[PDB]
Amino acid sequence: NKLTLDKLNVKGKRVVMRVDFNVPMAAAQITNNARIKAAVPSIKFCLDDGAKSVVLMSHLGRPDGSPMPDKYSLQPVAAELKSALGKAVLFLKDCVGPAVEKACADPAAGSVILLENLRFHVEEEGKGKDASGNKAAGEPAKIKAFRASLSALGDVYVNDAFGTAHRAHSSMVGVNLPKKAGAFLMKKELNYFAAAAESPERPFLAILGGAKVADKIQLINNMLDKVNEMIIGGGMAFTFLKVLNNMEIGTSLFDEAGKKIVKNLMSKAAANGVKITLPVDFVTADKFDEQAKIGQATVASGIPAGWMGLDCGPKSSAKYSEAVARAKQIVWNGPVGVFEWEAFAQGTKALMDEVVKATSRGCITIIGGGDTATCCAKWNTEDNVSHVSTGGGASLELLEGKVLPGVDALSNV
Numbered sequence: 127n128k129l130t131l132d133k134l135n136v137k138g139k140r141v142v143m144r145v146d147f148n149v150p151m152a153a154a155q156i157t158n159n160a161r162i163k164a165a166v167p168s169i170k171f172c173l174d175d176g177a178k179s180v181v182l183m184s185h186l187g188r189p190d191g192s193p194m195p196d197k198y199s200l201q202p203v204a205a206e207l208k209s210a211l212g213k214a215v216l217f218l219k220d221c222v223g224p225a226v227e228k229a230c231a232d233p234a235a236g237s238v239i240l241l242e243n244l245r246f247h248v249e250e251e252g253k254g255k256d257a258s259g260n261k262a263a264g265e266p267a268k269i270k271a272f273r274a275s276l277s278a279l280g281d282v283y284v285n286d287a288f289g290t291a292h293r294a295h296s297s298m299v300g301v302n303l304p305k306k307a308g309a310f311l312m313k314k315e316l317n318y319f320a321a322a323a324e325s326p327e328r329p330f331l332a333i334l335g336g337a338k339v340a341d342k343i344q345l346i347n348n349m350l351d352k353v354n355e356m357i358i359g360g361g362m363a364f365t366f367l368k369v370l371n372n373m374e375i376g377t378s379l380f381d382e383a384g385k386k387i388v389k390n391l392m393s394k395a396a397a398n399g400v401k402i403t404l405p406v407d408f409v410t411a412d413k414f415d416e417q418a419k420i421g422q423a424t425v426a427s428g429i430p431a432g433w434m435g436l437d438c439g440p441k442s443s444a445k446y447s448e449a450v451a452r453a454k455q456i457v458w459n460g461p462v463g464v465f466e467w468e469a470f471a472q473g474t475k476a477l478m479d480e481v482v483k484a485t486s487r488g489c490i491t492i493i494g495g496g497d498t499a500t501c502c503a504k505w506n507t508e509d510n511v512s513h514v515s516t517g518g519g520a521s522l523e524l525l526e527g528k529v530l531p532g533v534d535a536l537s538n539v
């Protein structure tokens with residue numbers, strides 16, 4: 127129940143749109159467009175429906191509030207967006223101030239304008255570091271002024287920056303305009319997660335991977351309140367196997383703080399009637415290196431001193447596949463092994479194959495932002511799963527059961 131773009135009247139209006147263009151880069155070059163392309167359907171909707179202008183605003187990297195036009199400029203994105211949009215883009219060297227306001231005042235109808243990095247101003251995050259590297263605090267009156275300037279750039283506001291929705295930054299919660307609508311990406315992201323957090327199809331399987339356990343306690347706990355099954359893989363699994371089974375784990379990752387909560391998580395799973403699938407075999411490595419000598423092990427055999435489990439084995443792949451086969455809805459957050467290294471990416475690759483097949487027969491498959499999304503990109507499965515999230519931190523907070531400041535700030539329907 128929140129206002130979305132498709133239900134917003136834009137004809138003859140200046141649209142001030144927050145987008146998450148915080149794209150990866152490398153030596154003044156974009157290394158992945160995804161976030162830019164993800165926001166194009168919203169930009170076009172506005173143009174096609176007669177918007178007077180669409181003023182795009184975003185942050186890039188973490189300049190921590192000082193104009194770093196040399197390393198963190200959004201200028202390259204303007205030329206990239208012009209190619210994707212097939213339309214000229216007016217790039218402005220600032221995002222607030224009299225001159226920027228004057229430029230967005232009465233733009234030529236159909237104008238697309240891209241503002242400079244919002245994080246060049248400490249008022250966006252509300253805090254930062256000075257030149258010396260010292261932490262500086264934003265001033266309240268300056269915060270108000272900054273927000274009032276952004277508000278002048280449009281008659282209506284659209285937030286399509288899902289990747290930034292967990293941030294209560296000025297551009298996300300401070301735009302004072304009567305109409306604040308979530309755009310098409312934001313809509314899609316919330317639509318699917320509404321699936322995971324409210325009315326999931328069943329069985330509902332949650333696949334949780336990664337290294338640390340302590341930072342995922344809430345994610346695991348929240349998911350235990352909603353799923354029918356849960357696969358616990360990746361490095362996390364070793365804390366569970368060590369505690370529950372007393373498995374010899376070698377130099378495999380072990381979370382000391384998290385190990386103290388393992389029995390409590392299993393207890394909840396039991397009470398909620400959740401079937402937990404943990405790995406039973408592994409692909410070992412003599413060291414955490416892409417080219418480390420590899421081996422094999424099982425929970426029963428244990429992992430040799432010095433060696434570490436970096437991926438699940440064949441038997442674990444079977445059990446995982448069986449869980450996927452039983453699911454009508456799946457939420458996957460975190461690969462099941464070191465996917466970055468080919469030798470330890472096979473379990474993840476195999477699981478992806480199963481998730482893709484599940485989607486083909488009607489399973490609603492939701493891939494979390496970040497690492498899992500990167501895997502979809504690497505193996506070209508974006509068009510093969512139901513949803514691939516554009517925001518790692520944002521989707522994690524949602525799966526944790528948290529309210530997103532950027533979503534909460536939107537108008538209601």
Ligand SMILES: Nc1ncnc2c1ncn2[C@@H]1O[C@H](COP(=O)(O)O)[C@@H](O)[C@H]1O
Pocket residue numbers: 335336337338359360361362379435436437460461462463464465466497
């Ligand atoms: N069995 C494992 N051992 C060590 N690292 C793993 C393992 N499985 C997944 N990972 C890594 O954990 C990651 C994400 O960890 P996290 O920051 O907790 O999300 C990726 O960098 C993976 O390479």
Ligand SMILES: [Mg+2]
Pocket residue numbers: 496497
């Ligand atoms: Mg990660």
